Design a protein around this ligand. Structure first.
Ligand SMILES: Nc1ncnc2c1ncn2[C@@H]1O[C@H](COP(=O)(O)OP(=O)(O)NP(=O)(O)O)[C@@H](O)[C@H]1O
Ligand SMILES: [Mg+2]
Length: 268
C-alpha cells in the first residue's frame, strides 16, 4: 500500500499520443538518479478544470496495484497538474487492434482476451478498486497475445463534474453511483466491442435516447460471430438488477470454459 513519487526532473515528454475524458497521454522518457539512462514511459496529464499538489489516499490505492493483466502505475508526480506515469506499450489499444486485423484474429486468441480482461478486473475487485471507465480503448496490448486493463480509478481523482455514457450501467447514469457491479456492465459492452471487431456501441443514436432504449430492454444487438451462449454472457452484464449480474469470478470461468474448444462458441 504505497506509490512512488517522481521528481519533475526525472520525467521528460517527447510526443503527445492523444487525450480522453480526463487527461492527455504523452510518450516520454524517464531519467533517474542524475546519470543518463533512457526508459520509455507513458505520461498522462490530469488537471482540475484545485491543484494536485498533495497525494490523496486514492492516489496510493491506484499506485499499490500490480497484476499480470493490469497496466501498473509505476509512479506519480504531483504539481499544478497530476502526472500519471505508466510503461509504454507500442502495440497500443485493443480497440484499434481489432479494427485493423478484425476477423483474421484467432477465435482462440480472441477468447483468451475475454479471460485476460476478467482476471485483471477480478484483481481490481479483490483490492476493492472500482475502475469506473472500462472500455476497449482502455484495454491495451502488452504483448501480441497479452492484454492489460488500463485507466482504472482515474475518474475518482476529480470532483463530480460533467462519451463513457455508452459504457455506463443504468444506475450509474441515473444515480451517479459506481460499484464493482457497474463495471461488470462496462465489461459487457467491452466484450461486445471485441466481438464486433471494434464496432461503435449504439451507433448513430442520440445520447439522450440511450437511457430509454436499454431501459425498454432492447439492449445491444447480437454480434455476427457470437453463438447465443457467448451472447448471453454479455446479456447478464446488462441486467437492471446488479445482484444478478455476474461476478468477474464467473466471467473468468465461462470464457475459459469456452476457450477449451474455441470454434464451438465463435465462428468467422
Ligand atoms: N501505456 C500506454 N502506452 C501506449 N499508449 C497509451 C498508454 N496509455 C494510454 N495510451 C494511449 O493514449 C491515448 C489517449 O489516452 P486517454 O487520455 O486515456 O484517452 P482514451 O484512452 O482514448 N479514452 P479515455 O480513457 O476514456 O480518456 C489513447 O490512444 C491510448 O491508447
Ligand atoms: Mg484511456
Amino acid at each position: 500500500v504505497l506509490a512512488r513519487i517522481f521528481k519533475e526532473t526525472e520525467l521528460r515528454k517527447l510526443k503527445v499520443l492523444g487525450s480522453g475524458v480526463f487527461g492527455t497521454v504523452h510518450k516520454g522518457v524517464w531519467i533517474p538518479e542524475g546519470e543518463s539512462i533512457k526508459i520509455p514511459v507513458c505520461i498522462k496529464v490530469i488537471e482540475d478544470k484545485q491543484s494536485f499538489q498533495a497525494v490523496t489516499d486514492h492516489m496510493l490505492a491506484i499506485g499499490s496495484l500490480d497484476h499480470a493483466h493490469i497496466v501498473r502505475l509505476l509512479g506519480l508526480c504531483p504539481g499544478s497538474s497530476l502526472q500519471l506515469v505508466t510503461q509504454y506499450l507500442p502495440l497500443g489499444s485493443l480497440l484499434d487492434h481489432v479494427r485493423q486485423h478484425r476477423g483474421a484474429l484467432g477465435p482462440q486468441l480472441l477468447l483468451n482476451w475475454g479471460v485476460q480482461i476478467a482476471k485483471g478486473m477480478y484483481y481490481l475487485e479483490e483490492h476493492g478498486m472500482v475502475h469506473r471507465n472500462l472500455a476497449a480503448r482502455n484495454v491495451l496490448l502488452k504483448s501480441p497475445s497479452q492484454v492489460q486493463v488500463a485507466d482504472f480509478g482515474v475518474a475518482d481523482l476529480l470532483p463530480p463534474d460533467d462519451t463513457p455514457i455508452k459504457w455506463m450501467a443504468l444506475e450509474s447514469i441515473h444515480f451517479g453511483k459506481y460499484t464493482h457491479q457497474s463495471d461488470v456492465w462496462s465489461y459487457g459492452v467491452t466484450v461486445w466491442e471485441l466481438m464486433t471487431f471494434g464496432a461503435e456501441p449504439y451507433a448513430g443514436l442520440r445520447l439522450a435516447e440511450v437511457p430509454d432504449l436499454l431501459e425498454k430492454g432492447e439492449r445491444l444487438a447480437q454480434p455476427q460471430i457470437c453463438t447465443i451462449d457467448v451472447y448471453m454472457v454479455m446479456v447478464k452484464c446488462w441486467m437492471i438488477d446488479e445482484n444478478i449480474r455476474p461476478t468477474f469470478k464467473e466471467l473468468a470461468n465461462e470464457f475459459t470454459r469456452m476457450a477449451r474448444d474455441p470454434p464451438r462458441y465463435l465462428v468467422i
